[PDB]
Design a protein around this ligand. Structure first.
Ligand SMILES: *C(=O)[C@](NC(=O)[C@@H](C(=O)O)c1ccc(O)cc1)(OC)[C@@H]1N=C(C(=O)O)C(=C)CO1
Length: 353
């Protein structure tokens, strides 16, 4: 650990943990393509288990990046096309409002107002279909972005249909395995429960609860090591040997839509680098008009590529700059203000060139 990296990391994370009351936290910095790890506090306050490099943390929305990439991998294999209508992979979606809504709109939250979350009452597959048939668009497709688990989560589910595989099998087989993310899961196996940190909310230890389209929108758990590897694969896709997975990573970083200084990829979100920290940090249900990027701009190396995520008891953040071979991962078992995460991440990366 170069003292440089050591000092900026600690100078930054320490006051953060104290101000936010974060019980446990793991940080990885990818510098010149090499990971450096750091860890603080507790994975389980009660059983006094410290956070280590093997601790699993709930990723929350950062899970969408895996989905964007899995989806991009399905495109690469010629199994789906973002230009296909949604109904091509779910012919039972015969309600009229769906004509014109494409897999692209699903993956980028531009379908016309699909809700932030699938309602808790949706139990079964039959319940999911009904929910979608009855959903009433507030806007025409491709006009506004409204961040949503029901939007991407559906994209993920359909993206894997032609393969005959379930979303978990597809994810494990086409993404976790090739990239050697052997400690990343949608369902934490009994053998790895000893490392599953607890989340904390209002002082109580909690874990994410099951829900429809959970795997696809916020269901991944992973370690600081695998997340650092996940960042290295996204920084340098051209080292990935699996052809389709390589294009897939590239496709998830293509710029499909623009909102202010932000560009929407598949899961990942991007801004041109150099970037103002304020342009990312503090400037809900924020509907935002979007401009289509026709055709999409291929992955741009001079970008600040990122994704924020949370569950009831976890706060996570990932951000990297391809052009600089620079990256960072922040995993905490306490959801804390998103602006403090980006503020911390920028302070570290910008300090490393
Ligand atoms: C992504 O992190 C985010 N939230 C979540 O994924 C989960 C959470 O909020 O704890 C989650 C779990 C179960 C659900 O039915 C819904 C969400 O995506 C929704 C985060 N949360 C937001 C919010 O609660 O409004 C956002 C606006 C940004 O993304």
């Amino acid at each position: 650990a170069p003292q440089q990296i050591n000092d900026i990391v600690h100078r930054t994370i320490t006051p953060l943990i104290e101000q936010q009351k974060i019980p446990g936290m793991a940080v990885a910095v990818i510098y010149q393509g090499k990971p450096y790890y750091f860890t603080w506090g507790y994975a389980d306050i009660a059983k006094k288990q410290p956070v280590t490099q093997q601790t699993l943390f709930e990723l929350g929305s950062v899970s969408k990046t895996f989905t964007g990439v899995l989806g991009g991998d399905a495109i690469a294999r010629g199994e789906i096309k973002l230009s296909d209508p949604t109904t091509k992979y779910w012919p039972e979606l015969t309600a009229k409002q769906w004509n014109g809504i494409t897999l692209l709109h699903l993956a980028t939250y531009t379908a016309g107002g699909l809700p932030l979350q699938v309602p808790d009452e949706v139990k079964s597959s039959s319940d999911l279909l009904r929910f979608y048939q009855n959903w009433q668009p507030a806007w025409a497709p491709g006009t506004q972005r409204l961040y949503a688990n029901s939007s991407i989560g559906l994209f993920g589910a359909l993206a894997v249909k032609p393969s005959g595989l379930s979303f978990e099998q597809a994810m494990q087989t086409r993404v976790f395995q090739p990239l050697k993310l052997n400690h990343t899961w949608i369902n934490v196996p009994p053998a790895e429960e000893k490392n599953y940190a607890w989340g904390y909310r209002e002082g109580k230890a909690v874990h994410v609860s099951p829900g429809a389209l959970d795997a696809e929108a916020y269901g991944v758990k992973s370690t600081i090591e695998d997340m650092a590897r996940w960042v290295q694969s996204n920084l340098k896709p051209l080292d990935i040997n699996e052809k389709t997975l390589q294009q897939g990573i590239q496709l998830a970083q293509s710029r499909y839509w623009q909102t202010g200084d932000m560009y929407q990829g598949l899961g990942w979100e991007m801004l041109d680098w150099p970037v103002n920290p304020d342009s990312i940090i503090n400037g809900a249900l924020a509907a935002r008009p979007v401009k289509a990027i026709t055709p999409p701009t291929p992955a741009v190396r001079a970008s600040w590529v990122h994704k924020t995520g949370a569950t009831g008891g976890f706060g996570s953040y990932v951000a990297f700059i391809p052009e600089k071979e620079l990256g960072i991962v922040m995993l905490a078992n306490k959801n804390y203000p998103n602006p403090a995460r980006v503020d911390a991440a920028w302070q570290i990366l910008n300090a490393l060139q």
